[PDB]
């Protein structure tokens, strides 16, 4: 694996000798939990909503309040 053998432009990864092409089902399977993986997106969604509320209230009241509800 010298990075010079590309299956597609911009995709040149190769498994190293003695290692699997796919880790799913192998001794290196990370077994990540789907719900756990989505935690960042879930957090951002809630955060974006809190900010939207602050922005909206600031525009209608003329004063910025971080803790508004």
């Amino acid at each position: 694996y010298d990075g010079q053998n590309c299956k597609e432009p911009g995709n040149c990864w190769e498994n190293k000798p003695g290692y699997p092409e796919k880790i799913a089902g192998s001794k290196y399977d990370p077994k990540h939990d789907p719900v756990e993986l989505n935690k960042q997106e879930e957090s951002i969604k809630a955060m974006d909503a809190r900010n939207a509320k602050r922005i909206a209230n600031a525009k209608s009241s003329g004063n910025f309040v971080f803790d508004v509800k």
Partner: protein, 571 residues
């Protein structure tokens, strides 16, 4: 915005952390020069009342200076007519737990300025705009969630009516993104992720049209197995650059997560990428991945320097950058064409070289990392041959003065699960000096480079890594702070040391300069910390602690202790 431009065009002002939109971190102020630098002395000083690493440098707007500390991220406004009076201050209330999810000390790289406001963030993820004269908070919004391991450390970057802010946390599996906010209201305009769908990454229709071999669409997911990209790192916590004419801003995305390369087969795009994005839409015009499938934590967030120089006689709009991987890159900043890719030191062995035609590193298997194997004498180490330091460029001699690290490592990964809020590294390291120091013990270098050829002009060795960076002033001087506590000035022609002062503690930021009442001043933060100082800062003694950094920097605490403040010098 227009107000920022006004300050940028004000002689002696310092409204941008990197020295200007092109981030050349230099100054035309020439009062202090080679002939009189020996007479420079301390003018005054200011303690932040905080310990830990004090990165970045203060801002100077008109006759006002703004100083910032490490966590809890305090801001102090001083009028230069009387540095003894704190005109206004902002001392944030943050949960102490915030520090627990910060990988590399509770550092803060600085403030930004725009529309008469000081733009400041907090480690806990808040971004605020404060009136520069009264300190009144105009807006305060959430950018990062520490509960999932996301924090803020980099300096915000203002361009037109936009504030660019990126979260940190790749060591905790945080999926990186450049978040854009309205300078006036703090409203989220958009965010460009480093991994995932093209829509989330925000790629223009003509993305990499000039270099299709760099890769174009669908790679944000195709170069990963399954949903591994969701916790794939790529955070951008370094520095930005901006070209007003092209309306493109530039920055580098960080390392993929975890450090265990075996747990994430694939090129892992678009982590470790140099970007050229439209400021208004955030859409990428071009993107070059420096390190496909990272195996060494070469977080590609280092400074982007824009310059216009002749390449073999032809004037070219350039972007230069020295990555953690030890490669000095120079690309055409308009289209992304790769022009230079040279090793900053011959010790670099992870790659035999970077192929200019294929555009990728020619990897050397002997120095790769992988499960069930201990890689040895790998250069550069994870700390890189260059880290968060901000370097300077002299437009006259056309030279970049780089603050480099000369540290290599041993590395072996191990399996571990991902749990939001917990660290997600998966590797044990040992770090030590590179092989080329004069006594084979030196870990720092100030090396001058021609950015059009990537060749070095001279080298000055330092006992410890040149972590903060360098500042270049027209008097022919290269200023920089050392981890052991000195502010120094070198003759830019040969690197000869002409002046030095023993500050209270090591410096990890880059020097800045400004003028006041017809006098040039040099300002430097002091207070050792950051990755190099974790051993001293957190009372660690295990050589493998701090991910190998503790052992490498074991001697630092015999030369310096913690601190936190600013020292200003002048004639």
């Amino acid at each position: 915005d227009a107000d920022l431009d006004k300050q940028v065009n004000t002689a002696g002002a310092w409204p941008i952390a990197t020295g200007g939109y092109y981030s050349q971190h230099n100054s035309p102020l020439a009062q202090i020069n080679k002939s009189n630098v020996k007479n420079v002395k301390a003018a005054w000083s200011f303690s932040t009342g905080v310990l830990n690493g004090h990165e970045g440098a203060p801002l100077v707007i008109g006759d006002m200076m703004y100083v910032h500390s490490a966590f809890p991220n305090n801001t102090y406004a001083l009028n230069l007519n009387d540095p003894g009076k704190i005109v206004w201050q902002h001392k944030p209330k943050q949960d102490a737990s915030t520090k627990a999810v910060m990988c590399c000390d509770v550092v803060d790289r600085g403030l930004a300025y725009g529309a008469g406001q000081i733009v400041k963030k907090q480690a806990n993820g808040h971004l605020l705009a404060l009136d520069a004269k009264t300190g009144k908070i105009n807006w305060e919004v959430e950018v990062c969630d520490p509960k999932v391991g996301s924090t803020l450390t980099q300096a915000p970057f203002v361009a037109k009516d936009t504030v660019l802010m990126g979260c940190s946390g790749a060591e905790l599996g945080v999926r990186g993104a450049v978040n854009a906010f309205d300078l006036k209201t703090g409203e989220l305009k958009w965010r460009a992720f480093a991994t995932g769908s093209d829509d989330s990454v925000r790629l223009a229709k003509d993305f990499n049209s000039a270099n299709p071999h760099y890769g174009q669409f669908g790679l944000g997911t195709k170069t990963w197995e399954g949903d591994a990209w969701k916790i794939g790192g790529g955070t951008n916590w370094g520095w930005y650059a901006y070209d007003p004419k092209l309306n493109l801003f530039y920055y580098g995305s960080g390392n993929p997560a975890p450090w265990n390369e075996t747990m994430r087969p694939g090129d892992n795009k678009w982590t470790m990428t140099i970007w050229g994005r439209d400021l208004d839409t955030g859409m990428a015009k071009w993107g070059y991945q420096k390190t496909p499938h990272d195996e060494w934590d070469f977080a590609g967030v280092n400074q982007m320097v824009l310059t216009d120089q002749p390449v073999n006689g032809k004037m070219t709009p350039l972007l230069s950058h020295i990555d953690r991987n030890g490669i000095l890159y120079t690309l055409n900043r308009e289209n992304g064409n790769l022009i230079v890719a040279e090793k900053v030191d011959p010790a670099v062995n992870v790659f035999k070289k970077v192929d200019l035609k294929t555009g990728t590193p020619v990897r050397d298997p002997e120095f790769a990392t992988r499960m069930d194997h201990k890689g040895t004498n790998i250069c550069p180490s994870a700390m890189g041959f260059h880290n968060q330091g901000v370097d300077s460029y002299d437009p006259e001699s056309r030279t970049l003065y780089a603050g480099l690290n000369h540290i290599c490592m041993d590395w072996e990964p191990f399996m571990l699960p991902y749990r939001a809020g917990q660290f997600f590294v998966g590797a044990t390291l040992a770090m030590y000096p590179g092989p080329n120091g004069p006594t084979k013990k030196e870990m720092g270098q100030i090396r001058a480079f021609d950015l059009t050829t990537g060749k070095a002009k001279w080298t000055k060795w330092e006992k410890f890594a040149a972590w903060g960076g360098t500042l270049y002033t027209k008097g022919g001087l290269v200023w920089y702070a050392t981890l052991d506590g000195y502010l120094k000035a070198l003759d830019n022609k040969d690197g000869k040391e002409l002046w030095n002062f023993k500050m209270p503690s090591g410096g990890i930021g880059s020097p800045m300069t400004y003028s006041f009442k017809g006098k040039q001043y040099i300002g430097s933060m002091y207070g050792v910390g950051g990755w190099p100082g974790v051993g001293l800062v957190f009372d660690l003694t295990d050589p493998s602690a701090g991910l190998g950094a503790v052992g490498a920097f074991r001697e630092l605490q015999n030369h310096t202790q913690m601190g936190g403040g600013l020292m200003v010098f002048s004639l």
